[PDB]
Enzyme design. Structure first.
Site, PDB file in Angstrom:
ATOM      1  N   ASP A   1      12.746  -6.958   4.710  1.00 29.22           N
ATOM      2  CA  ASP A   1      12.209  -7.823   5.297  1.00 29.22           C
ATOM      3  C   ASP A   1      12.743  -9.073   3.752  1.00 29.22           C
ATOM      4  O   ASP A   1      12.569 -10.916   4.294  1.00 29.22           O
ATOM      5  CB  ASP A   1      10.808  -8.572   5.761  1.00 29.22           C
TER       6      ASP A   1
ATOM      7  N   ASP B   1      -9.502  -8.519   5.155  1.00 32.24           N
ATOM      8  CA  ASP B   1      -8.848  -9.165   6.257  1.00 32.24           C
ATOM      9  C   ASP B   1      -9.336  -8.831   7.744  1.00 32.24           C
ATOM     10  O   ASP B   1      -9.927  -9.501   8.388  1.00 32.24           O
ATOM     11  CB  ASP B   1      -7.727  -8.940   5.987  1.00 32.24           C
TER      12      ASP B   1
ATOM     13  N   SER C   1      10.947  -9.408   1.369  1.00 29.94           N
ATOM     14  CA  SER C   1       9.659  -9.680   0.544  1.00 29.94           C
ATOM     15  C   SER C   1       9.709  -8.031  -0.603  1.00 29.94           C
ATOM     16  O   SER C   1      10.931  -7.986  -1.058  1.00 29.94           O
ATOM     17  CB  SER C   1       8.336  -9.695   1.046  1.00 29.94           C
TER      18      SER C   1
ATOM     19  N   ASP D   1       7.114  -6.127  -2.649  1.00 28.65           N
ATOM     20  CA  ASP D   1       5.680  -5.294  -3.528  1.00 28.65           C
ATOM     21  C   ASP D   1       5.381  -5.457  -4.714  1.00 28.65           C
ATOM     22  O   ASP D   1       6.499  -4.786  -5.619  1.00 28.65           O
ATOM     23  CB  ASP D   1       5.515  -3.771  -2.425  1.00 28.65           C
TER      24      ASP D   1
ATOM     25  N   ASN E   1       1.969  -7.703  -1.342  1.00 29.16           N
ATOM     26  CA  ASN E   1       3.230  -7.955  -0.797  1.00 29.16           C
ATOM     27  C   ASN E   1       3.304  -9.153  -1.049  1.00 29.16           C
ATOM     28  O   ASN E   1       2.369 -10.526  -0.807  1.00 29.16           O
ATOM     29  CB  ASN E   1       3.434  -7.815   0.505  1.00 29.16           C
TER      30      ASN E   1
ATOM     31  N   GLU F   1       0.574   4.326  -3.779  1.00 27.34           N
ATOM     32  CA  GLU F   1       1.446   3.855  -3.743  1.00 27.34           C
ATOM     33  C   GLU F   1       2.518   3.281  -5.666  1.00 27.34           C
ATOM     34  O   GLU F   1       3.291   2.639  -5.028  1.00 27.34           O
ATOM     35  CB  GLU F   1       0.302   2.368  -3.775  1.00 27.34           C
TER      36      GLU F   1
ATOM     37  N   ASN G   1      11.613  -4.548  -0.078  1.00 23.51           N
ATOM     38  CA  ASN G   1      10.887  -4.449   1.096  1.00 23.51           C
ATOM     39  C   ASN G   1      12.099  -4.941   2.047  1.00 23.51           C
ATOM     40  O   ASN G   1      12.892  -5.752   1.441  1.00 23.51           O
ATOM     41  CB  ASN G   1      10.086  -4.843   1.932  1.00 23.51           C
TER      42      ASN G   1
HETATM   43  C1  LIG Z   1       4.176   8.644  -5.812  1.00 25.16           C
HETATM   44  C2  LIG Z   1       5.152   7.049  -6.607  1.00 25.16           C
HETATM   45  C3  LIG Z   1       5.724   7.533  -7.555  1.00 25.16           C
HETATM   46  C4  LIG Z   1       7.273   6.458  -7.966  1.00 25.16           C
HETATM   47  C5  LIG Z   1       6.496   5.213  -7.420  1.00 25.16           C
HETATM   48  S1  LIG Z   1       7.882   3.972  -8.027  1.00 25.16           S
HETATM   49  O1  LIG Z   1       7.456   2.783  -9.177  1.00 25.16           O
HETATM   50  O2  LIG Z   1       8.517   3.099  -6.863  1.00 25.16           O
HETATM   51  O3  LIG Z   1       9.381   4.423  -8.478  1.00 25.16           O
HETATM   52  C6  LIG Z   1       6.005   4.876  -6.413  1.00 25.16           C
HETATM   53  C7  LIG Z   1       4.973   5.450  -5.767  1.00 25.16           C
END
Ligand SMILES: Cc1ccc(S(=O)(=O)O)cc1
Length: 129
Positions: free
Chosen positions: A48, A101, A50, A52, A59, A35, A46
């Site tokens: 929409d 949730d 929003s 993250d 989100n 993530e 995103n």
């Molecule tokens: C694996 C990985 C690499 C880089 C990112 S980033 O924070 O969106 O650049 C998120 C997840």
């Protein structure tokens, strides 16, 4: 802060994530990696409108307020910036609410597509927990 794999495993465990709602620690460590790459400062906007935030990419539409997401519910009652801290307490506390949730960890696309149904135990192997 960019967490090391075992370092993050230990902090998450200390914060009560191991087996939280039946999800072993490996699931949480695997989700954070895909993530945010273990980076507490990661942000992603995103389509929409929003955004993250943080280690678990929470989100702004439903969980936190970033002042620019119309119709934000702010269910975790915290400004999204609080989720970018080197101290993962806010992210972990909000994550516990999200996972409780209804769809469990499926709320995290990276977990569903890259962790779910894999040997997530490998994510904590070698770590002194
Ligand atoms: C694996 C990985 C690499 C880089 C990112 S980033 O924070 O969106 O650049 C998120 C997840």
């Amino acid at each position: 802060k960019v967490f090391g794999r075992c370092e993050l495993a230990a902090a998450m465990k200390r914060h009560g994530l191991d087996n939280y709602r039946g999800y072993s620690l490996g699931n949480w460590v695997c989700a954070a990696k895909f993530e945010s790459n273990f980076n507490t400062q990661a942000t992603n906007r995103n389509t929409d409108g929003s955004t993250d935030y943080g280690i678990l990419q929470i989100n702004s539409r439903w969980w936190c307020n970033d002042g620019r997401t119309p119709g934000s519910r702010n269910l975790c009652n915290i400004p999204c910036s609080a989720l970018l801290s080197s101290d993962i307490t806010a992210s972990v506390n909000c994550a516990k609410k999200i996972v409780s949730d209804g769809n469990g960890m499926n709320a995290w696309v990276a977990w569903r597509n890259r962790c779910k149904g894999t040997d997530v135990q490998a994510w904590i192997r070698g770590c002194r927990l």
